[PDB]
Structure formats: C-alpha cells, structure tokens
Scaffold this motif. Structure first.
Motif, PDB file in Angstrom:
ATOM      1  N   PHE A  32      -9.580  33.782  50.744  1.00 31.22           N
ATOM      2  CA  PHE A  32      -9.554  33.188  52.069  1.00 31.22           C
ATOM      3  C   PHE A  32     -10.021  31.739  52.007  1.00 31.22           C
ATOM      4  CE2 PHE A  32     -11.568  32.636  56.406  1.00 31.22           C
ATOM      5  CZ  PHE A  32     -10.360  32.364  57.031  1.00 31.22           C
ATOM      6  N   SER A  36      -7.227  28.971  52.857  1.00 33.79           N
ATOM      7  CA  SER A  36      -7.357  28.349  54.173  1.00 33.79           C
ATOM      8  C   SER A  36      -7.616  26.852  54.017  1.00 33.79           C
ATOM      9  CB  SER A  36      -8.450  29.036  55.008  1.00 33.79           C
ATOM     10  OG  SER A  36      -8.498  28.555  56.345  1.00 33.79           O
ATOM     11  N   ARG A 183      -7.578  30.007  61.918  1.00 32.07           N
ATOM     12  CA  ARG A 183      -7.531  31.112  60.974  1.00 32.07           C
ATOM     13  C   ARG A 183      -8.854  31.855  60.909  1.00 32.07           C
ATOM     14  NH1 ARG A 183      -4.249  27.254  58.799  1.00 32.07           N
ATOM     15  NH2 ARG A 183      -5.956  26.334  57.596  1.00 32.07           N
ATOM     16  N   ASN A 187      -9.634  36.019  61.968  1.00 32.22           N
ATOM     17  CA  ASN A 187     -10.467  36.947  61.225  1.00 32.22           C
ATOM     18  C   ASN A 187     -11.726  37.354  61.981  1.00 32.22           C
ATOM     19  OD1 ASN A 187      -8.708  37.310  59.045  1.00 32.22           O
ATOM     20  ND2 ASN A 187      -9.530  35.538  57.944  1.00 32.22           N
ATOM     21  N   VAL A 199      -5.544  36.914  54.823  1.00 32.60           N
ATOM     22  CA  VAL A 199      -5.405  35.635  54.138  1.00 32.60           C
ATOM     23  C   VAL A 199      -3.991  35.099  54.342  1.00 32.60           C
ATOM     24  CG1 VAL A 199      -5.398  34.456  51.911  1.00 32.60           C
ATOM     25  CG2 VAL A 199      -7.024  36.298  52.325  1.00 32.60           C
ATOM     26  N   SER A 248      -3.436  43.257  53.471  1.00 33.15           N
ATOM     27  CA  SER A 248      -4.891  43.491  53.419  1.00 33.15           C
ATOM     28  C   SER A 248      -5.207  44.974  53.396  1.00 33.15           C
ATOM     29  CB  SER A 248      -5.608  42.871  54.622  1.00 33.15           C
ATOM     30  OG  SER A 248      -5.502  41.459  54.638  1.00 33.15           O
TER      31      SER A 248
END
Length: 262
Positions: A32, A36, A183, A187, A199, A248
């Motif tokens: 991540f 990101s 992002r 999450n 991700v 995921s």
C-alpha cells in the motif's frame, strides 16, 4: 457472486492466527505504502521502501524527502486504522486535515490547510476542482453526507468507500496529497467495517485514471456535479474497487489458511 463467496469465506476465518495475520498485515503495509506513493511520482524502489518500513534502513540512491513522505504516509495508514477501529468516531474534517499535515511532512512553496490558489489542471481538456471559496462548504457537506450514510446503513462498504473517494477527489481540497488521502479514506471505510484493505497498484495507473475519467463524463464536469455524484454515476469505479477487494480477499483467505503470499 464471486466477491460475496470470498467475503463469506473471509468472515468465517476470523480471527486469523496472529502469525498468519502479521504476514498479511506486513505485506499490505508494504504494498500500500509503495503503490499509493508511487502513483503520485515517488521514485523509491521496492527495496528502498521495504528496508525502510521493516528495518528503518536506507539503501541505494534516494532523497531524504522520498524517505520522509514514504514514512509519513505509513504514519497516515496507522492513523486511519486507529480512527476506523474506534467505530463510534465519525469522520471529521479535522481528521482529514491532520492526515494531510501528516503525510506531507511540512509546509511548502508553489500543509493541513485547504487550497487558496485553485488546484486545477488543463490535461487540452480542463479539470475543474472545487474553488478555494466553496471548498470548506463542500467539505462540511461531504463529512455530513458520509456520516449520514454510515447512520442509515444502506450502502455497502465498497460502495460508500467508492463514493467517498470519488466525491473527495472531485473536491480536491488540499494543494497536494489528494490522491493519497482519497485512497487512505477508502481503506478507512473498509477497515472500519471489517474488510481487508485494498491496494490500487501503480502499474494499473492509467486504468485507474481511465475509470474515473468515465465517471467524470457521467456526473457532470462542474465541481458541484462531482461533489454530488450519485452511486449510479460512479458504477465503473465501484466495480474497480470491488475487483481490488477480490484480490485482497483472495490473498487474505490464502494467508488465513497458512499458505504463502509473498
């Protein structure tokens, strides 16, 4: 159907044995943070990144700043986890501002404050985000909207996450870091409601931008239209996040069963 089966299986394996859970969490933190930040042009390699987050060691060639933003973003991830886990804490403008302040380490010349010069871009097709004047009103509406959806419990977490991301990204409130905040907010939603975090991979950047460029045509090109985009307007992006969640879930189930992931 496919995603619902995976979700059901995931819920059945809760709680994971702590060593299986750690493997999952370690891999996610790594991927991540890397992706990101890579999406926004951070040029730390995967090795540079891994040795930072697992050992606090630097390697190869880099700038101190690349290490700092990567590190600050991970503090940001920790923040959203903690905020999400406290299920009675509503999404606040102050939390989002603190998030910006955190991941962008410190102030700059052209943090944690809404845009004062417009954040727009003429890609020749112009991109109009919220004006500096209407931004605070738009943001108060966004958090009020979000927490109302949280109360009435109609939207699925993937839907709510997708729409939060989209509306936020269309407001584009800060001078910088809005991609990473979006992002992070996804999450935040997923973690709060017991889903494994996702991700968006930087190798898929053009596809990611494309999907949001389709939604843009549907909702309306004005900053108001983006801020008020409906679920049906952003359906291609809802599907996109679902395909990530599928990835995921599949990996997380694999970890729970003790099998390899890395």
């Amino acid at each position: 159907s496919n995603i619902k089966q995976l979700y059901s299986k995931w819920k059945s394996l809760q709680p994971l044995k702590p060593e299986d859970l750690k493997r999952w969490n370690d891999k996610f933190k790594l991927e991540f943070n890397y992706n990101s930040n890579h999406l926004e042009g951070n040029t730390l390699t995967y090795g540079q990144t891994k040795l930072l987050l697992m050992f606090g060691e630097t390697s190869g060639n880099a700038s101190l700043k690349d290490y700092e933003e990567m590190k600050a973003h991970n503090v940001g991830l920790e923040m959203i986890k903690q905020e999400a886990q406290d299920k009675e804490r509503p999404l606040t403008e102050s939390f989002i501002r603190e998030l910006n302040r955190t991941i962008l380490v410190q102030d700059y010349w052209k943090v944690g404050e809404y845009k004062s010069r417009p954040n727009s871009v003429l890609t020749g097709e112009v991109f109009s985000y919220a004006s500096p004047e209407e931004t605070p009103a738009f943001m108060t509406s966004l958090v009020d909207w979000y927490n109302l959806e949280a109360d009435k419990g109609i939207l699925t977490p993937v839907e709510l996450a997708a729409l939060l991301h989209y509306r936020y990204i269309r407001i584009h409130p800060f001078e910088d870091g809005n991609g990473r905040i979006a992002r992070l907010l996804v999450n935040f939603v997923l973690h709060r409601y017991g889903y494994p975090m996702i991700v968006i991979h930087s190798e898929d950047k053009s596809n990611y931008l494309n999907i949001l460029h389709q939604c843009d045509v549907e909702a309306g090109l004005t900053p108001s239209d983006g801020a008020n985009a409906t679920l049906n307007d952003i359906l291609p992006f809802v599907n996109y996040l679902s395909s990530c969640l599928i990835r995921s879930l599949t990996l997380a189930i694999k970890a729970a069963k003790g099998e390899s992931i890395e």
